[PDB]
Write a protein that binds this ligand. Structure first.
Ligand code: ADP
Lengths: 223, 801
């Protein structure tokens, strides 16, 4: 009858839901997931109103509606700033036990993202801050592992060094930034690296401050 | 006229059979797209529009002018092909679909499709589909120049590329940027949308190279030496890809020139300025000869109405009890008759925008200093309206839920006390029952008041948003005039709002004001209103103050959030910026008159969320962004004029004392130090708008919390009714205050009117002392000085004893 038909349609919809929930979270594409959700919306709306008035159909429709409204939650979560420390921390807060290698969208969809929006957004903001700090560390590493002295010949007797101003400004910028790292409580991650960079930058500052004086005095006395 | 003939020929080439009506239609379309395109005001636009049909009919009689010209003249190849004329609605649907696809692709911010925006999109699309189709836009900031240019470029497959300017932006950086864009365009056969604003155009050094690039099709001499050899090597590869093997350097160089001309469209976005545009013409003729002109300024009333209608879909604003007023105040001529509440409120918003145009024009006529008003201010105003409406509705709903929960708890407790009475104590129990019933009636009355506030919320929110977003630059008197005009307009439309609404009270509470007063903030009304503006903002505020109290106040307010100081003039400005934007702390900035255009991405709030990382592009360097970043721009000079581009990206907070602000301050001081009873009655009147209500709600919440601990022990002496007697006497006091508010406002007005002349004299004396500097450089006096005389007069005066 009509009840049997709507039960069969519900079983088909649930099977499709299970099928795409079997996709591991590593291999899930948020845009394709949203497109599949919209396709299910179109398929469900194609059902007759008599089948649409059933309570189970309404429950599945509102569950999918929750899924689309948390699709942007998933998109934010499907970043690279999460690392794994933030994921473990939100495991601890949510008191759920999953496997990173075996992680799929199904378990996270079972967890009420809407009920835990505040915690999820806080974790996302924490991850963004930590990723920003680590990205600045990467940037400083790449700019100091590639910086070269602008050597230039001098009277064919030696090869002096110029560009003091730009190098001093760069070092001052970096040392001010690393000094400012101590605040912004997200600094409680990656501490020894920041201290090592600060120490090496202070060494560079002292060495080159002595070096410029030595150079000017030597060139004056040479003349 | 040769471009006229070229366009007509291009339109006629795909087609083979046309009646005279089609030919005249194409002629008129090209006339519209070439002549009236560059027109500025409306009068000459209508002149050109009528003279086109005059000429067409005079030189072509015996033709049906209805089909020959239609008022919505439009041509495109998007519907079908072959540049067939299309109707407005079909192309509107097509552009809606394509803009939806764009939304899923980039620029999630919504767009509203009125007639002007669609016409501009069509014009830009026509210009792009042309060899050496360079384009120049002249229109007020925020009218949709860069946005529409980017949208049309993307829809054509034209990859956008814009240069980010900053301080010490040397000509060599611009040369490198041109080398990069030329390599991307000509060598790789990748079409480029090269979109320049006016900030980087200010320097004439780049303008000469841009002039040569526009005119010749490519600047000679941008590639020289080793980079020239790399260009030749990559051009060999490019010619290999096209199967056009060429060996000699000049031959493949001119092929590269042809590729650049075919695959490079430059779009310029200039803020309209007669002297600025004249200077631009002086330094370059290509911006008017080789560059076609498109003008579109302030949004029309239709555009503003549709933008408001689309941006006000989400909040309810359905009031079924709304009655259409007789003589509806209408600024939109296509307003539905009879209109519902939503049409009325959006029309009121459009009226607010238009009346601020009128007020700015009047103030310019008076000879004062005017800040430009742009549609970005309108969008910020609608965002403030939506945010405040959602917040206030949520607060009222939560308060109603709390009242319902309290009522249910009271019902349970009455049932429990009846059961405990079932078993001198009985007299106390009966007294408790009667007191609880009276408190229930008070609950019902408070529910009625809640319904009244729910009725008022829409108009109250509209006025609050209009004040907080639009105003702020004007003085206290002008702010009051604008607020009174808006209130009068809302009264005309029968939009429910409290007639005695106070801006300071409605948009804050007690603890925020106490915190502000803890920091170096005077109790002046202008200071309180501008602190309100400083608390809530979508665009980062610009603070102007001749006194400097603003910097100290905002330093103290954000001291716990490691806020720091930085001015534009120093060389540490860029590094302080980068620090603030990356580590997530506020950055108060001073001396804004020497504005650095590098802040444009920051003010625009245009961020890119890609690869698990939000990036804000400062100059040529991509910088990560922290959510806890608020930036404040400040200046000490109060008479400096700002470019409208900056004027349209920040909200103005004004602290300059004026003849009305100082008069109000002195009058308030007189009331405080001379008639303390009148001052405290005025303070009670001000606090009646919620503060007394909030204290009553908090006290009854405490009563509910205490009643939760019942366990039969509430009948220790069978009279816990002392707390509810305290509540009852407090409610009686506040009810008396509400009932007699009319006599209170009357007596406050009388006393203020009596004490007004002293305040006026104080203002005149202080401004004379301030103006004493023109007689002699020696005669310099400060506001604090006049305040010292004022206190020596009010207090420690032997004569008054
Ligand atoms: N039709 C529209 N509907 C909604 N918002 C719009 C519309 N046109 C423009 N906007 C908004 O106004 C802004 C226009 O900026 P734009 O004028 O391109 O900057 P510029 O003045 O630097 O060229 C955009 O941020 C966009 O969000």
């Amino acid at each position: 009858q009509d009840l049997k038909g709507v039960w069969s349609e519900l079983s088909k919809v649930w099977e499709q839901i299970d099928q795409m929930k079997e996709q591991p979270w590593v291999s899930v594409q948020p845009r394709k997931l949203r497109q599949n959700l919209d396709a299910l919306l179109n398929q469900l709306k194609s059902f007759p109103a008599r089948l649409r008035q059933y309570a189970s159909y309404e429950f599945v429709q509102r569950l999918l509606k929750g899924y689309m409204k948390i699709n942007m939650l998933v998109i934010e979560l499907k970043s690279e700033a999460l690392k794994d420390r933030h994921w473990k921390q939100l495991m601890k807060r949510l008191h759920v036990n999953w496997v990173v290698s075996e992680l799929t969208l199904g378990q996270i969809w079972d967890v009420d993202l809407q009920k835990n929006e505040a915690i999820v957004k806080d974790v996302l903001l924490v991850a963004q801050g930590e990723m920003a700090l680590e990205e600045f560390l990467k940037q400083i590493r790449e700019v100091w592992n590639t910086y070269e002295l602008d050597l230039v010949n001098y009277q064919n007797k030696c090869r002096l060094i110029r560009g003091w101003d730009d190098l001093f400004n760069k070092v001052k910028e970096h040392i001010n930034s690393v000094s400012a790292m101590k605040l912004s409580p997200y600094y409680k991650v990656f501490e020894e690296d920041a201290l090592s960079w600060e120490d090496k930058l202070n060494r560079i500052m002292a060495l080159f401050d002595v070096w410029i004086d030595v150079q000017r005095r030597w060139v004056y006395l040479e003349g | 006229m040769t471009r006229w003939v070229r366009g007509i020929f291009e339109a006629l080439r795909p087609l083979e059979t046309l009646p005279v009506e089609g030919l005249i239609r194409i002629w008129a379309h090209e006339a519209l797209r070439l002549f009236q395109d560059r027109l500025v005001e409306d009068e000459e636009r209508r002149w050109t529009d009528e003279n086109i049909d005059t000429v067409a009919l005079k030189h072509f009689p015996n033709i049906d002018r209805e089909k020959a010209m239609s008022r919505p003249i439009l041509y495109s190849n998007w519907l079908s092909k072959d540049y067939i004329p299309v109707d407005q609605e079909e192309l509107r649907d097509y552009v809606k679909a394509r803009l939806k696809v764009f939304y899923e692709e980039e620029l999630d911010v919504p767009l509203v499709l009125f007639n002007e925006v669609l016409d501009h999109v069509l014009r830009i699309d026509r210009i792009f589909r042309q060899p050496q189709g360079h384009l120049l836009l002249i229109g007020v900031s925020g009218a949709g120049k860069t946005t529409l240019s980017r949208f049309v470029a993307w829809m054509n497959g034209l990859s956008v590329y814009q240069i980010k300017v900053h301080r010490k932006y040397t000509g060599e950086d611009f040369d490198e940027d041109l080398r990069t864009v030329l390599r991307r365009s000509g060598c790789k056969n990748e079409k480029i949308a090269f979109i320049m604003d006016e900030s980087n155009v200010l320097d004439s050094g780049f303008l000469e190279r841009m002039n040569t690039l526009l005119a010749n099709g490519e600047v000679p001499g941008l590639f020289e030496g080793d980079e020239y050899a790399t260009l030749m090597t990559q051009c060999k590869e490019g010619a290999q890809k096209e199967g056009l093997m060429l060996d000699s350097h000049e031959e493949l160089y001119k092929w590269f020139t042809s590729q650049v001309i075919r695959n490079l469209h430059v779009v310029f976005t200039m803020n309209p300025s007669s002297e600025g545009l004249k200077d631009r013409a002086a330094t370059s003729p290509a911006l008017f000869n080789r560059c076609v002109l498109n003008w579109f300024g302030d949004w029309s009333t239709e555009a503003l109405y549709q933008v408001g209608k689309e941006f006000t879909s989400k909040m309810d604003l359905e009031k079924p009890n709304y009655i259409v007023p007789d003589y509806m105040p209408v600024v939109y001529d296509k307003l539905p008759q009879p209109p519902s509440h939503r049409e009325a409120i959006v029309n009121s918003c459009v009226f607010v925008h238009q009346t601020l145009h009128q007020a700015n024009a009047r103030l310019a006529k008076r000879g004062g200093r005017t800040m430009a008003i742009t549609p970005r201010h309108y969008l910020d105003f609608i965002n403030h309206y939506a945010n405040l409406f959602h917040e206030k509705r949520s607060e009222l709903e939560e308060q109603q839920m709390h009242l319902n929960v309290g009522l249910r708890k009271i019902k349970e407790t009455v049932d429990q006390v009846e059961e405990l009475r079932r078993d001198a104590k009985v007299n106390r129990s009966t007294a408790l029952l009667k007191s609880l019933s009276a408190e229930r009636e008070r609950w019902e009355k408070t529910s009625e008041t809640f319904k009244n506030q729910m009725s008022t919320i829409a108009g109250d929110c509209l006025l609050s948003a209009a004040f907080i977003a639009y105003a702020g630059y004007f003085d206290q008197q002008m702010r009051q005039n604008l607020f009174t005009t808006w209130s009068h307009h809302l009264q005309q439309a029968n939009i429910q709002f409290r007639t005695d609404i106070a801006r300071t009270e409605y948009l804050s509470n007690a603890d925020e004001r106490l915190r502000w007063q803890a920091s170096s903030l005077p109790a002046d009304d202008l200071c309180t209103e501008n602190a309100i503006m400083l608390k809530r903002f979508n665009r980062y505020p610009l603070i102007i103050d001749p006194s400097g109290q603003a910097t100290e106040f905002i330093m103290n307010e954000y001291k716990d959030r490691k806020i720091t100081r930085t001015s534009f003039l120093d060389d540490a400005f860029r590094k302080n910026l980068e620090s603030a934007l990356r580590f997530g702390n506020p950055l108060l900035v001073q001396d804004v008159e020497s504005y650095d255009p590098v802040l444009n991405p920051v003010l625009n709030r245009e961020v890119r969320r890609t690869g698990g990382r939000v990036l804000i592009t400062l100059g040529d360097q991509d910088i990560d962004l922290s959510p806890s970043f608020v930036i404040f721009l400040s200046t000490r000079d109060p008479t400096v004029e700002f470019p409208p581009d900056l004027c349209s990206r920040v909200t103005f907070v004004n602290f300059t004392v004026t003849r009305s602000s100082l008069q109000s301050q002195c009058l308030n001081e007189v009331l405080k130090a001379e008639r303390p009873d009148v001052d405290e009655k005025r303070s009670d009147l001000l606090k009646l708008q919620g503060e007394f209500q909030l204290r009553l709600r908090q006290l009854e919440k405490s009563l509910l919390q205490a009643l939760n601990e019942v366990k039969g022990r509430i009948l220790d002496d069978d009279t816990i009714i002392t707390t509810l007697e305290n509540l009852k006497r407090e409610a009686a006091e506040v009810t008396r205050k509400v009932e007699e508010t009319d006599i209170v406002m009357q007596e406050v007005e009388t006393v203020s009117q009596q004490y007004l002349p002293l305040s006026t004299a104080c203002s005149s004396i202080y401004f004379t002392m301030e103006s004493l500097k023109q007689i002699h450089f020696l005669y310099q006096y400060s506001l604090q000085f006049f305040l010292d005389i004022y206190h020596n007069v009010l207090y420690e005066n032997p004569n008054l004893k």
